[PDB]
Amino acid sequence: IDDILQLKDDTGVITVTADNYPLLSRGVPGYFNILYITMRMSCQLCHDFEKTYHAVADVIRSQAPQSLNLFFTVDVNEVPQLVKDLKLQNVPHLVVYPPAESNKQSQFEWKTSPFYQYSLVPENAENTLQFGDFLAKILNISITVPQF
């Protein structure tokens, strides 16, 4: 699965495409999947939380290097299957898939697997603290985001 890990762009975030979706949606054993479902005003919300998302991703990579998490970003306009699969009616969404239970790995997929969803609204679009706290609790890590 070193393949998937090496998909991390310069910011440590993995772009879901219509191609790698079937693969990525099956996740990585033991890895949390943090998935930002976006589209580039809901467009403004999408763009705003992008920065927050990356900020916290960076914080987590930096301060929780051991954490088994993968940050994904998906543009709903690039992978329509994800849209159908996740029954998406709008954007953005930030969902977090816990790793599948070892015994239920094969049945893991973003579309059927339970997930935490971060309440993403304009009021917290730029709140790295709240989002960091959200991931921190899920990832069971203690992080300090520069934000007061």
> What are the C-alpha distances in Å from 31 to residues 6, 63, 83, 84?
14, 17, 22, 24
Sorted by where each begins, the domain ranges of the chain are 1-148
CA distance 52 to 119: 13
Contacts of 71 (CB under 8 A, 6+ apart): 8, 12, 13, 14, 34, 36, 53, 57
Determination technique used = X-ray
Angle between helices 128-139 and 42-63 (to 10 degrees): 50
CA distance 112 to 114: 7
- Kindly state the tokens that stand for 137: 């609790």
Q: Write the residues followed by a gap in the chain (C–N more than 2.5 A).
A: 40, 147
Q: Does domain 1-148 have CATH number 3.40.30.10?
A: yes
User: Taking a C-beta distance cutoff of 8 angstroms, is the pair 45, 118 a contact?
Assistant: no
CA distance 51 to 138: 20
Write the DSSP assignment of 28-91 as a string of letters: -TT-EEEEEEE---HHHHHHHHHHHHHHHHHHHHHH-TT--EEEEEEETTT-HHHHHHTT--SS
CA distance 59 to 131: 11
For residue 33, which of 116, 141, 130, 148 has the smallest C-alpha distance? 116
> What are the C-alpha distances in Å from 65 to residues 60, 101, 102?
7, 22, 22
Contacts of 29 (CB under 8 A, 6+ apart): 1, 99, 100, 102, 105
Helix (H, G, I), strand (E, B) or coil at 104: helix
